[PDB]
Structures are given as C-alpha cells and as structure tokens.
Amino acid sequence: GAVTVVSWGGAYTESQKLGYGDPTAAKLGIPVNWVDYTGGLSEIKAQKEAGAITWDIMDVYAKDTIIGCDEGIFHEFDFDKDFLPAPDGTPASQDFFTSMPSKCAVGNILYSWNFAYNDAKIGDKKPKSIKDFFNTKKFPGKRAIYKGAMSNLEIALVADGVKASGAQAGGDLLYRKMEGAGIDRALAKIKKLCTDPNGGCVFWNAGAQPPELLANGEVVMATGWNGRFFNAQMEGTPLVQVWDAQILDYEYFALVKDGPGYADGSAMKVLAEMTSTEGLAGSAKYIAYAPWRKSSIAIMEAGEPWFKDGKTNMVPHMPTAPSNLKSHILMNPDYWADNQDEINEKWEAMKAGLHHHHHH
Structure with missing residues (x-):
C-alpha cells in the first residue's frame, strides 16, 4: 500500500x-x-x-x-x-x-529565510543588508514579502535597529522584544514599505514565487527560502542572496x-x-x-x-555556514505557535487596510 x-x-x-x-x-x-x-x-x-x-x-x-x-x-x-x-x-x-x-x-x-535580488536587473547599486530591503530611496521598486506575519515581523524589527542575538540557550533575544509594542512597530514598518509609492508589496505564498518574481523583474527584492534561490541560481538565473538578518529555521x-x-x-x-x-x-x-x-x-x-x-x-551555500550566520536570527517556533492567532488578526487588518486605501 x-x-x-x-x-x-x-x-x-x-x-x-x-x-x-x-x-x-x-x-x-x-x-x-x-x-x-x-x-x-x-x-x-x-x-x-x-x-x-x-x-x-x-x-x-x-x-x-x-x-x-x-x-x-x-x-x-x-x-x-x-x-x-x-x-x-x-x-x-x-x-x-x-x-x-x-x-x-x-x-x-x-533552512533560512533570507532575501535576494536579480543582479542583472537591480542596477549599479547592490543591496547588502536588511536595511537595504526597506530602503525605497536607495532602492526604489516593489518588494515581495511572505503572506504571513511570521518572519516579516522579525526582519522588520531588525531593519528598525532592534537587535537579534542569533542562536543561544533560550532562543533568540529578539522575541522578548516582540510584545505588543514591538509587534506594533513591526506592523508599522511593513505598512510603510507597502504604502510607499517607491515601494509596494507582493505577498508570496509558494516557495517558487520569490525566485520567479525576481527572474521576471516583477519585484526588485524578494524574501524567500534560501534553497529556492539556490535552485534558481544553479539553473542560471543571476540572483544574489543577502544573508543579513537571515532567519535560521x-x-x-x-x-x-x-x-x-x-x-x-x-x-x-x-x-x-x-x-x-x-x-x-x-x-x-x-x-x-x-x-x-x-x-x-x-x-x-x-x-x-x-x-x-x-x-x-555545498557547504558554503548552507544555512549553517559561518559566513551565512554572521547576523542571523534564530526562529522561535513556540512564539508563533502561541501567538500566531492574535498576531494574524492585526496582520490581516493591516493588509486589508492596504487595499482599502489603495487607489486604482
């Protein structure tokens, strides 16, 4: 059977x-x-x-x-x-x-949550940091970000200068900074990116979407899973992965x-x-x-x-290679198991507001 x-x-x-x-x-x-x-x-x-x-x-x-x-x-x-x-x-x-x-x-x-750009389309200036992912003045264009709050709130806070520890006993110190006030800051940061006329957001749901959106020039930068970007690179697509504030999961x-x-x-x-x-x-x-x-x-x-x-x-491409871990966040699954319903209500209300204030 x-x-x-x-x-x-x-x-x-x-x-x-x-x-x-x-x-x-x-x-x-x-x-x-x-x-x-x-x-x-x-x-x-x-x-x-x-x-x-x-x-x-x-x-x-x-x-x-x-x-x-x-x-x-x-x-x-x-x-x-x-x-x-x-x-x-x-x-x-x-x-x-x-x-x-x-x-x-x-x-x-x-695996890692990280982001990538298309080196053949991005232009002369090259993204290097999670702050660059949010920098619509230096890097104008649409971004692709994950459909759910998970991973987005972490990278938003780190882009806001809140410090993650990476792996250590007890999990990443970032999660103690993700109570109500920190969640609100993270939501505001995402809303800012998605409402910026020089930004804007496509929400991806399936693992192949980030590399496809970059290959087709539909966004200038996309978060995604490192192995999906790796596969596209090995197929010849000129993507470059950025590992600053990658989330090890x-x-x-x-x-x-x-x-x-x-x-x-x-x-x-x-x-x-x-x-x-x-x-x-x-x-x-x-x-x-x-x-x-x-x-x-x-x-x-x-x-x-x-x-x-x-x-x-393969070692230099792995989520666990020391060069790729320099500024990582360690995913905390208890945090999301415990809090995803409460957080998702606020996240989906934010996404609904993007549409309600959007003019065709």
Whole structure:
C-alpha cells in the first residue's frame, strides 16, 4: 500500500523525492507519493474532521509540529525506538543535533529565510543588508514579502535597529522584544514599505514565487527560502542572496494519525527510512538545506563537492555556514505557535487596510 507525503513542491519536493523518497520506496516495497501544499494545518484539519484522511506524513513548519501535536493530529514518537541510529550506533536522539520542539516532530533539514535580488536587473547599486530591503530611496521598486506575519515581523524589527542575538540557550533575544509594542512597530514598518509609492508589496505564498518574481523583474527584492534561490541560481538565473538578518529555521516531518498507512505501520516505516543518516545527507546533493543529523552533516562535508554535479561544494551555500550566520536570527517556533492567532488578526487588518486605501 502507498504512503502519501505532503510537502512544498518545486525544488524542495524534488530534493526529497530524489534524496530519500524514491530510494525508500524502492528499498521497502512501499510506494511513496508526493502531494504539494503551502504549509499550515487547515487541509489536514478538514480531512480529519470529515473522517477522510488521505495524507500520511507531512513536511511541516516547526510551529505546526507543536500545534498539530497539541491538537491530536500528529503521532507522538518514542524517538529512539522509532528513528534509526547513526551508522556508528549513536542513538537518533544524540545524532539529531538538538532536541525536538514537540514529541510529534522529527527533523529533516535546516533552512533560512533570507532575501535576494536579480543582479542583472537591480542596477549599479547592490543591496547588502536588511536595511537595504526597506530602503525605497536607495532602492526604489516593489518588494515581495511572505503572506504571513511570521518572519516579516522579525526582519522588520531588525531593519528598525532592534537587535537579534542569533542562536543561544533560550532562543533568540529578539522575541522578548516582540510584545505588543514591538509587534506594533513591526506592523508599522511593513505598512510603510507597502504604502510607499517607491515601494509596494507582493505577498508570496509558494516557495517558487520569490525566485520567479525576481527572474521576471516583477519585484526588485524578494524574501524567500534560501534553497529556492539556490535552485534558481544553479539553473542560471543571476540572483544574489543577502544573508543579513537571515532567519535560521528547522523543518520537520510529522506522522498523521489515522492516515491510510497509520494502523498498518507502513507510514512509520517510510518515515524512519526517509529520515535516516543516508537519506537526509542525500537530499543535500540537490538543494542547499542542511541535514538535521550530525552523521549526515559529516558525510556531506567529507564528500565535497556534494552537489549532484560532482563539482559544486555545498557547504558554503548552507544555512549553517559561518559566513551565512554572521547576523542571523534564530526562529522561535513556540512564539508563533502561541501567538500566531492574535498576531494574524492585526496582520490581516493591516493588509486589508492596504487595499482599502489603495487607489486604482
């Protein structure tokens, strides 16, 4: 019987299918099929409430491992019984480089939220900082920004000169500065960019939109996920990524309770093999997302050039390369799991106001 994995399409799903999905299906004799979505829990909630679940495994945002666990959508793992040790015998919990954010989470890769421009279209002056992303006088033109408040409020505050710490025990210090007053400042900063006649905003929802919008010259700068920009670069599009105030974030799989392959154990078997040392390392032959396991990282580093072509080194492109981390923010998934409803109400009211005050 087949197992249905839900992921984000384009270059990301491709990296998963080629790195670990197709090898897992061939090894186990369990077909592994891929469905595209754009994140969140609304589809799986609708399926669950209808008694008609067709999804088995979801590739999810960190915050959604927490929510989906708390809502009883996802299965609570027994981590070292359910997931495979490293080849040398290291238990999975010691191989995954840090702890899980929820009992329902198993890591796959790490990624960055950053931004890019089209070097062939931007002109002689070249963006270099998150402040440049917001600077409509030096860099006039439309921006593409993410449809949701998450990530936008962080970069807005850093562009306003509020300091992030990057990773440290307890999470990024930026989040303590994102109470009501800080949220209001961040909303005002985004509203300012989007209302500026020399700015303006396109809200992107799907991972391929930022590179496409830049390739077509529809915006001068776009936030996005670094692996999507990387894919476009390797296809020859002259994008340049800017890593100032990049947000380092962690991605996961979760197992859907009562999906087609749940009771018979087939979905768990697929999940354990996809998240193996070899599987997670294999995905990084295709896209610049870093494996969650120390064992997989070591394989990639020893095997450079690790890209599929046998000549492009992948380490300098990774979210975790020291050069790319110089001014990073560490995503806090508890903050967004706890506060996204309250924040989203204000965010969507701001977006609705952009339209209501817009003159054709």
